[model samples]
Target: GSSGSSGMSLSDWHLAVKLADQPLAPKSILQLPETELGEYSLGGYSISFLKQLIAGKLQESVPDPELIDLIYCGRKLKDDQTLDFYGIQPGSTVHVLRKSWSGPSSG
Candidate 1:
């Protein structure tokens, strides 16, 4: 819950989200080499936020399924909603580009 600018980090957010999905087996999502989460031009949220949110949402909406367990896929931004972008990777998961204003400052 603490994606902090201090010693805490966004990677922790990713891990928390991943672990929260009760149906998901630990370490089941990453079959490939652990790729460093990339920077996003997809608005305010970092790559980890986007990825984790996507996974979280899917786990909630479409249970008993692992979208990340599918075949060939690529994460690509497909639509824009305000400052947020919607990306649905084939056989992967759907992601979002959070608004720049969406942060602790807004809270």
Candidate 2:
């Protein structure tokens, strides 16, 4: 559509992601600013990238917590994929889930 970056302003939208099991009440609802889809991994707004942005807060709520997946609009997103590829729009809701335990203690 080449609208000169229309609807691309980072502050124009505020999307929220919820933690499935660990509910931190109001803090669990992480409202992120509008993000660009085409940007680099560190610069983009993919669920993978978003982790770095909110990992600190999540860790604070749950000890040794690890965010392994992101669910949005009833769809699971890949770490390397961009939001645009999944047709994710503004105001969409995303859910963060922790990685399941696969094995016994490493120690």
Candidate 3:
């Protein structure tokens, strides 16, 4: 039962962001578009690293990667988890929500 274990794999997803506080703010695309993390294994990438990459894209607002949380499939995502590892399809839309220190993250 060999499924072929070479490192090369596909990785591409759009980080579409929406304001956690500002209900009126429009969804912002991270602009990462299409495929390619170059030198890094597509499926091998961690959600944490992806957050850091998109943090720069969201810099105009809060920008801090630690200050935001990644949400997918309607649930908060874990940092160590892989992108497609959680059943996320290629080019899936990832939601970024800004942290609200005012209250605990119950949702």
Candidate 4:
């Protein structure tokens, strides 16, 4: 695991974003820009806000606001969680998906 730690360096940080349930679209990789406490910080961006940005980039709209979910490293995230809370360091990939539901049908 020690080597794995060194495998990723902050100097090469970039965030990879992809849409879940659909793999046809091209993935977006955003290079982590240098930032200080002045304006931009990891805590400043909300998972919800990122959802909108991704939707806009993909030219799609959320069918159901509550169904919009962001998954990072295989974990479904909460609306209140920030990117940092998800351990979304540079060079991480985030999956955006609409929560699917299947309930009991009429007998």
Best by TM-score: 3
Instruction: Provide TM-scores for the models.
Output: 0.20, 0.55, 0.59, 0.58
Model 4 Cα lDDT, one tens digit per residue, 40-101:
34655567766665555545544554557777878877768877776666566788787765
lDDT of 1 by residue, 41-61 (tens): 223333443344445544544
Clash pairs, candidate 1, are none
Ranking by lDDT: 3, 4, 2, 1
Poorest lDDT segment (10 consecutive residues) of candidate 4: 5-14
The reply for model 2, stretches above 4 Å from the true place, is: 1-10, 22-24, 27-44, 62-67, 101-107
Query: What is the Cα-based lDDT of residue 93 in candidate 3?
Result: 66
On lDDT, the leading prediction is 3
Question: What overall lDDT goes with each candidate model?
Answer: 0.33, 0.58, 0.67, 0.64
Candidate 1 residues lying further than 4 Å off, grouped into runs, are 1-42, 60-107
TM-score, cand. 1 vs. native: 0.20
TM for candidate 4 is: 0.58
| RMSD to true structure for each model, in Å | 16.8, 9.8, 11.1, 12.6
Question: Candidate 2's residue-wise lDDT over 1-107, tens digit each?
Answer: 66575553335445566766655655344445543453333234556766654554566543333436666777676778876777776566667666665457573
